[PDB]
Amino acid sequence: SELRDRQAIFETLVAKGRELLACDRVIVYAFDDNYVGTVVAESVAEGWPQARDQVIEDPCFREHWVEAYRQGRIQATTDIFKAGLTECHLNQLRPLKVRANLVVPMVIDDQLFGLLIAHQASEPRQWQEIEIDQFSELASTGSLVLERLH
Ligand SMILES: *[C@H](c1[nH]c(/C=C2\NC(=O)C(CC)=C2C)c(C)c1CCC(=O)O)c1[nH]c(C[C@H]2NC(=O)C(C)=C2[C@@H](*)C)c(C)c1CCC(=O)O
Ligand SMILES: [Cl-]
Ligand SMILES: [Cl-]
Ligand SMILES: [Cl-]
Ligand SMILES: [Cl-]
Ligand SMILES: [Cl-]
Ligand SMILES: [Mg+2]
């Protein structure tokens, strides 16, 4: 079924993603029609909370960024505590443990399905060009598989 096929692909993407970046967490964050995200798959290193199966409503995507991410926007943040974020934003990440993050889009049938997100949990991390390119290509490849499989 479509549901069973998707999950296996999500698991591949998060496993490969964390291997490529050797970071603390990679997730697939999938949007519903409210642009509320669910963590549908996760690969996480020892000692960190499991973000799997969390529903996280963050209005900034629908209110500002969905079309930009469809067009290939990313977020690369070396230190989330120096990114001028509000407490609301910091509060949603604190249960997970995020000190640096890399967010790339998953676009299927010209719509923003979700985001493929990498975390470093306890130290800043400048994401390098080759890492961003690798991770962006992973998410784009996985998205295109999903787009073509059914
Ligand atoms: C936009 C915004 N949110 C996120 C969210 C995440 N980062 C992650 O690692 C994860 C998975 C755990 C999530 C989810 C990102 C990356 C961005 C930036 C998008 C960009 O510019 O590309 C954002 N959301 C908030 C939350 C805040 N705003 C509200 O209205 C309410 C309510 C909030 C608390 C829930 C903030 C402050 C931003 C940044 C400013 C903006 O884009 O509006
Ligand atoms: Cl969903
Ligand atoms: Cl938009
Ligand atoms: Cl744009
Ligand atoms: Cl482009
Ligand atoms: Cl088909
Ligand atoms: Mg199709």
Author numbering: 435 to 584
Q: What is the paper's account of this structure, in its own sentences?
A:
Of interest was PixJ from the thermophilic cyanobacterium Thermosynechococcus elongatus (Te), which transitions almost completely between blue light-absorbing Pb and green light-absorbing Pg end states using a phycoviolobilin (PVB) chromophore. In addition to the conventional thioether linkage that connects C522 within the GAF domain to the C31 carbon of the A pyrrole ethylidene side chain, PVB is attached via a second thioether linkage between C494 of the GAF domain and the C10 carbon between the B and C pyrrole rings. The end result is conversion of C10 from sp2 to sp3 hybridization, which shortens the π-conjugation system of PVB and induces the substantial hypsochromic shift from green- to blue-light absorption. Comparisons implied that photoconversion involves isomerization at the C15=C16 bond, a rupture of the C494–C10 thioether linkage, restoration of the π-conjugation between the B and C pyrrole rings, rotation and translation of the bilin in the GAF pocket, and conformational rearrangements of the protein backbone and surrounding amino acid side chains.
To help unravel this photoconversion sequence, we produced a construction of the GAF domain from TePixJ, hereafter called TePixJ(GAF), that enabled production of crystals that retain reversible photoconversion between Pb and Pg as well as thermal reversion from Pg back to Pb. From large-scale crystallization trials of Pb in darkness, we identified conditions at pH 5.5 that would generate yellow rod-shaped crystals. Remarkably, upon irradiation with blue light at room temperature, the crystal color transitioned to magenta, which returned to yellow/brown in darkness, revealing the presence of a photochromic bilin. In an effort to generate a crystal structure of TePixJ(GAF) as Pb with minimal X-ray–induced damage, we used continuous vector translation across the length of the crystals to lessen X-ray dose. The asymmetric unit was occupied by 2 TePixJ(GAF) molecules (designated units A and B), which dimerized in crystallo via a 4-helix bundle involving the α1- and α5-helices. Additionally, the electron density for both PVB moieties and the adjoining thioether linkages were well-resolved and continuous. Superposition of the 2 molecules in the asymmetric unit showed that the main-chain atoms were highly similar throughout (root-mean-square deviation [rmsd] of 0.47 Å for all Cα-atoms) with some differences noticeable at helix α4, which appeared to subtly alter the atomic positions of the adjacent PVB moieties within their binding pockets. As in previous structures, the B-ring propionate of unit A formed hydrogen bonds with H498 and W499. However, this contact was altered in unit B. Although the hydrogen bond with W499 was retained, H498 was displaced by R507′ from unit A in the symmetry-related molecule, which formed a salt bridge with the B-ring propionate of unit B.
